[PDB]
Design a protein around this nucleic acid. Structure first.
Lengths: 101, 97, 120, 74, 55, 126
RNA sequence: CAGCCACCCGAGAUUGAGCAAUAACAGGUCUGUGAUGCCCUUAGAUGUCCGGGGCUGCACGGCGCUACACUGACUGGCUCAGCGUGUGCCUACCCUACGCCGGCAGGCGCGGGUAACCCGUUGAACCCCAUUCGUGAUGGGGAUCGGGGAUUGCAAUUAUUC
RNA sequence: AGGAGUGGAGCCUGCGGCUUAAUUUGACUCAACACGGGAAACCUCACCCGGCCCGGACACGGACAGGAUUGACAGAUUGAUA
């Protein structure tokens, strides 16, 4: 079997891109094929709430946005190198799900 | 509402063997899955704890709808000497190092 | 079972808020500055950043151990799956939370407002 | 808003009165010239009922109430 | 009364089945995305949870 | 004169046949409270029905019975009993004709009415 | 000079919001708060039980509505222009495709969906506009209660019925 | 300069008038009033009303060894589980 999908996600795009470059460079340094970083659409969680803690005042709202950036990367490689690369002490703020399909 | 004694004795024993109790309890409903097997209404436990605080033997902290207790040497000694539960049971607040 | 990605992000945010508020209420006498959290597979490490380390670890490492319990029993982690450490932030005057706690402590000891503010 | 306004209603009405007693003796079957119990009465072969509880006769409603079920043969 | 009259109909779903997970307040709750806070507690903790004002 | 026909559908012809196949053709509405089953949570309505039909036959106002139930309907034998709201403030007494089967407006009893309207004049602008 | 008004190698020549100072208000919030100063005492205590019901006792000189008309019509025209939610960790209560009851509210059944993966190519106007406009009370209401039959929630009586 | 507007020719609520409360708890406006994210048939600020309660289960003035802690219920127990 040579079908492995790794899901990368984070709120911060800097860490996401750095860890994606880490994974791609780790895959390509050793003789191995790897797909490009599929870039899934960003999810914009929107919540609007009145600023005031009471009923008085002009109706001014707060629009809190929360951006979730997620990527999927394919891998045709033995599971050993995948497990070694996954345990590379990734940067904080990034959630990773390595799936062996 | 029911006022037993041995249910509170079991609650005291679990508190001594743990330090904190882990059983969500609702005054409105008699049984909750965490409350079960320790069937004493929340009101009983927190009223007894408020009486205890008015007396004073134990430490506590509060955060986001949750209690976090700390049983020190005073509470261990008090539960030891009142209920005549012998020290063959070792407290769980001094495990390891 | 497993939940959606946005819900997992919201859940970790609320967990961080819980943790920060809890350690501000509890560690209000040592002088509380902040927290860092790092994740590896089923190993979550939490670090409490404070100005006094010899005071926050406690006798024989009691408090630092006890905190684990009040994390483990609350956050719902599997047994022995939570680890937490203690390091000292390099500086103190550049953390607004730390200096706010210091001013709060000074006003808790009865030191006058203007002289405490001048000191900070 | 305004308060409950439930203090001045129900005139010339009294509460339901429940008798104050000291002992639960005559509540059971006690007609044996000594108040003792005989073995002729059967015991229910089921686990949901307490062993101590025994059948009794009341010229009204029933010796029950938590489950609100009449236990009489009828 | 304690367990005899109540609990004879489905009533586990009303507004009293919810409260703010920070202050146990039942008014102005936020159910969206499941963080389950009131308006003001969420405004207080939005920076920490991960919601930042950009719009 | 004219008797009661069930909204253009025969009623005496309906009772001509048997009774087991009328539930398969049961009318719309007023059956939900007992729709959980012809079981418990129903004995009170039939108890009051027997009460009223023993104190007052159909085509008559009943004797001190104040039921707030819609009285799930199968036949215009509902007359002879009244749906009434009891509080010490609500008291309706109307004799209603037996044309009510599963359909509109068999209830003249009302639990509200307009409150005293004051004077609408004395100026409208300043 | 700082700049302003028009344009001759030429995609781009004021997008809209966020943040938003010093000093102030006896402005609002103690009915958001484990954020808190100064308090009450004794019986259907504001927390359980209230079939019924609180503004609804109301006449388009407070948001969101009628164009006396080819700029407007019911698919002979759509390989479409287009925010963002969605299920069980406390907690049963989520989004729903597809068949049948069907010519339909609503009900049944296996199915997909933790989500660019399923709802979904989201039914966000029908531009020739295959009932089809002459002096336009009469497509610019139809000043709305009758009808296959009317709800996953005790209560639908001025109200999710459709 | 205009367009859409308005207690007029429908729909949702915030005053034109109030004593079985029926609605205005924030107003010197434009910084009260579809605002308290307040669409109350959940127990809504209970609201108005024949509402089984104790929600004293803070240790020490009287303190019993039953504070008295149900009822679908046949006009005498005159509401769908008061």
């Amino acid at each position: 079997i040579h079908r492995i999908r790794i899901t990368l996600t984070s709120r911060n795009v800097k860490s996401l891109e750095k860890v994606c470059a880490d994974l791609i460079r780790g895959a390509k340094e050793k003789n191995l094929k790897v797909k490009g970083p599929v870039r899934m659409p960003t999810k914009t969680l929107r919540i609007t709430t009145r600023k005031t803690p009471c009923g008085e005042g002009s109706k001014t709202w707060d629009r809190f946005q929360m951006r979730i950036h997620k990527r999927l990367i394919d891998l045709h490689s033995p599971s050993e190198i995948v497990k070694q690369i996954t345990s590379i002490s990734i940067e904080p703020g990034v959630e990773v799900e390595v799936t062996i399909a | 509402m029911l006022m037993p004694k041995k249910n509170r004795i079991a609650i005291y024993e679990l508190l001594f063997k743990e330090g904190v109790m882990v059983a969500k309890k609702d005054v409105h409903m008699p049984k909750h899955p965490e409350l079960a097997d320790k069937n004493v209404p929340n009101l009983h436990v927190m009223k007894a704890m408020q009486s205890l605080k008015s007396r004073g033997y134990v430490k506590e902290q509060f955060a986001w709808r949750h209690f976090y207790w700390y049983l020190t040497n005073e509470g261990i000694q008090y539960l030891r000497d009142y209920l005549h539960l012998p020290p063959e049971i070792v407290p769980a607040t001094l495990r390891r190092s | 079972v497993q939940i959606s990605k946005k819900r997992k992000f919201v859940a970790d945010g609320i967990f961080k808020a819980e943790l920060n508020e809890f350690l501000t209420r509890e560690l209000a006498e040592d002088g509380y500055s902040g927290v860092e959290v790092r994740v590896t597979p089923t190993r979550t490490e939490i670090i409490i950043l404070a100005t006094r380390t010899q005071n926050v670890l406690g006798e024989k490492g009691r408090r630092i151990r006890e905190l684990t319990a009040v994390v483990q029993k609350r956050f719902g982690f599997p047994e022995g799956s939570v680890e937490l450490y203690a390091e000292k932030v390099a500086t103190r005057g550049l953390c607004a939370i730390a200096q706010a706690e210091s001013l709060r402590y000074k006003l808790l000891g009865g030191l006058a407002v203007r002289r405490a503010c001048y000191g900070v | 808003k305004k308060r409950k306004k439930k203090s001045y209603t129900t005139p010339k009405k009294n509460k339901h009165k429940r008798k104050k007693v000291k002992l639960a003796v005559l509540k059971y079957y006690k007609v044996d010239e000594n108040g003792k119990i005989s073995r002729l009465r059967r015991e229910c072969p089921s686990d949901e009922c307490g062993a101590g509880v025994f059948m009794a006769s009341h010229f009204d409603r029933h010796y029950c109430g938590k489950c609100c079920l009449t236990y009489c043969f009828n | 009364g304690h367990q005899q009259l109540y609990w004879s109909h489905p009533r586990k779903f009303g507004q009293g089945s919810r409260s703010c997970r920070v202050c146990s307040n039942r008014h102005g709750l936020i159910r969206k995305y499941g963080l389950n806070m009131c308006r003001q507690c969420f405004r207080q903790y939005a920076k920490d949870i991960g919601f930042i004002k950009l719009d | 004169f004219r008797k009661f026909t069930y909204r253009g559908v025969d009623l005496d012809q309906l009772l001509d046949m048997s009774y087991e196949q009328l539930m398969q053709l049961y009318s719309a509405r007023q059956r939900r409270r007992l729709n959980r089953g012809l079981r418990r949570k129903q004995h009170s309505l039939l108890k009051r029905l027997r009460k009223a039909k023993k104190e007052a036959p159909p085509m008559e106002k009943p004797e001190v019975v104040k039921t707030h139930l819609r009285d799930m309907i199968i036949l215009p034998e509902m007359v002879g009993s009244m749906v009434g709201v009891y509080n010490g403030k609500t008291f309706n007494q109307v004799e209603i004709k037996p044309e009510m089967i599963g359909h509109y407006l068999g209830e003249f009893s009302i639990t509200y009415k307009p409150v005293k309207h004051g004077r609408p004049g004395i100026g409208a602008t300043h």
